A paper describes a structure:
Each RBD at the top of the complex can adopt either open (up) or closed (down) conformation. Further, we performed cryo-electron microscopy (Cryo-EM) structure studies of the spike–Fab complex of three representative antibodies.
All three antibodies can bind to all three RBDs in the complex. 7B8 snaps at the thumb region of RBD, and all the contacting residues are within amino acid (AA)476–489 except P456. For 7B8, 4 out of 13 residues are the same as that of hACE2. No immune escape was observed for 501Y.V2 when 7B8 was employed, which showed the highest potency against 501Y.V2.
Author numbering:
A (entry chain C): 1 to 85, 89 to 117
B (entry chain A): 333 to 526
C (entry chain B): 1 to 106
The structure:
């Protein structure tokens, strides 16, 4: 019984910024790894970011200029503040396991830059 | 004067895995090497510093017999300035090494029908090894993000791996027993001689 | 940024048969390839990891295999629920990347 309470997709501007968060349900987001993936309609999946628990993060080819991730373990909400600009995608925030292997995801922040 | 226990090293019947190669100091004694070089029982005898025949007429201050078991075809990596998973993740020789490497095929002593899977070796590591350093830990290598807590599931995996040492394997795929003698000449008098 | 590709961008193969989907890495991905399945109305379901480790629970009719430059996923049999879009993910180098590939029926 795990899930992500995703922050709803905003209607941003071309060149503006935004920020989305995903609260945890069921699991302990304190010591898991949280991945952020964006699936753009009219395209395929595109890996965006990966966050550990101990403040170690890695990013994507195009989302490594205006994206910054964090894990509010106080609220157990994996969040990030991003720029915007070719970014209208249905972002998923999945969380990793060694056994299941990323079998719980986000629910599609429908973020658009226009 | 005493005799050095080269018998209790070369003719010891239990070598450890190359990832946990076993070091044994030789000191306060005097023995010979020009009988080992005369023994002709070995199949690889390379002295990187002094020539083997000359060395019997020397004296040494820090002798360490290092013993392990590798595959026959990977013996070339036991050498200074060398790449190879053995020389990378398991056992690096310093580029200024001054000693002898002694490898002999040990197919019958080791290669069982079911394989001697006591022999393991490191095939994963974050970085290589400074020479003569050893890694003994057996933590499950965590390349992922989550802590996998000893579970070899997704994105985690064991860093050590076995050897299928069986008589059915090829000549180069049969196990070799390897000994390395290092003769440092530093700020000290000698304790080993000929 | 290692990039992957999947040549059969779409295949119209019917029910109860055997198919394959190939991923091809323009660099070297030793063994850690993962096969993901996604259907509209569903959530992407990580089928295979390490390109050989058939993950638990999912049926045995999914079999991946490859070596460090090329990879395949074979669907030996097809009960109809197994028709979806299939992606692959490289995770040797940490900037993980995806591919593109879908399924269709006659
Ligand atoms: C080990 O024992 C064998 C058996 O006699 C002998 O041939 C060999 O010279 C011995 N080697 C050493 C270093 O004692």
């Amino acid at each position: 019984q795990v899930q992500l309470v995703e922050s709803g997709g905003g209607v941003v501007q071309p060149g503006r910024s935004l920020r989305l968060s995903c609260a945890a349900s069921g699991f302990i987001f304190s010591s898991y790894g949280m991945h952020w993936v964006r699936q753009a309609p009219g395209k395929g999946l595109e890996w965006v970011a990966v966050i550990w628990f101990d403040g170690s993060n890695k990013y994507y080819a195009d989302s490594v200029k205006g994206r910054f991730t964090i894990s509010r373990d106080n609220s157990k909400n994996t969040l990030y503040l991003q720029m915007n600009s070719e970014d209208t995608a249905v972002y998923y925030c999945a969380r990793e396991t060694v056994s299941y292997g990323m079998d719980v995801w986000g629910q599609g922040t429908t973020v658009t830059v226009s | 004067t005493n005799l050095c226990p080269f018998g209790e090293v070369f003719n010891a019947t239990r070598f450890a895995s190359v990832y946990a190669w076993n070091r044994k100091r030789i000191s306060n004694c005097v023995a010979d090497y020009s009988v080992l070089y005369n023994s002709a029982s070995f199949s690889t005898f390379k002295c990187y510093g002094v020539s083997p025949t000359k060395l019997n007429d020397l004296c040494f201050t820090n002798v360490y017999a290092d013993s392990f078991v590798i595959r026959g075809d990977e013996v070339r990596q036991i050498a200074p300035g060398q790449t190879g998973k053995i020389a990378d993740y398991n056992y690096k020789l310093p580029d200024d090494f001054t000693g002898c490497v002694i490898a002999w095929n040990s197919n019958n002593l080791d290669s069982k029908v079911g394989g001697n899977y006591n022999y393991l070796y490191r095939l994963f590591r974050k970085s290589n090894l400074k020479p003569f350093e050893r890694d003994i830990s057996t933590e499950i290598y965590q390349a992922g993000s989550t802590p996998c807590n000893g579970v070899e599931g997704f994105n985690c995996y064991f860093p050590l791996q076995s050897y299928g040492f069986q008589p059915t394997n090829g000549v180069g795929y049969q196990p070799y027993r390897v000994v390395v003698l290092s003769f440092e000449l530093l700020h000290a008098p000698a304790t080993v001689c000929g | 940024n290692i990039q992957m590709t999947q040549s059969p961008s779409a295949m119209s193969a019917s029910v109860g048969d055997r198919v394959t989907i190939t991923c091809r890495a323009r660099q070297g991905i030793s063994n850690y390839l993962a096969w993901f399945q996604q259907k509209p109305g569903k959530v992407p379901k990580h089928l295979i990891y390490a390109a050989s480790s058939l993950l638990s629970g999912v049926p045995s009719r999914f079999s991946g295999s490859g070596s460090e430059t090329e990879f395949t996923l074979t669907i030996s049999s097809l009960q109809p629920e197994d028709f979806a879009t299939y992606y692959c993910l490289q995770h040797n180098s940490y900037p993980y990347t995806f591919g593109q590939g879908t399924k269709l029926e006659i």
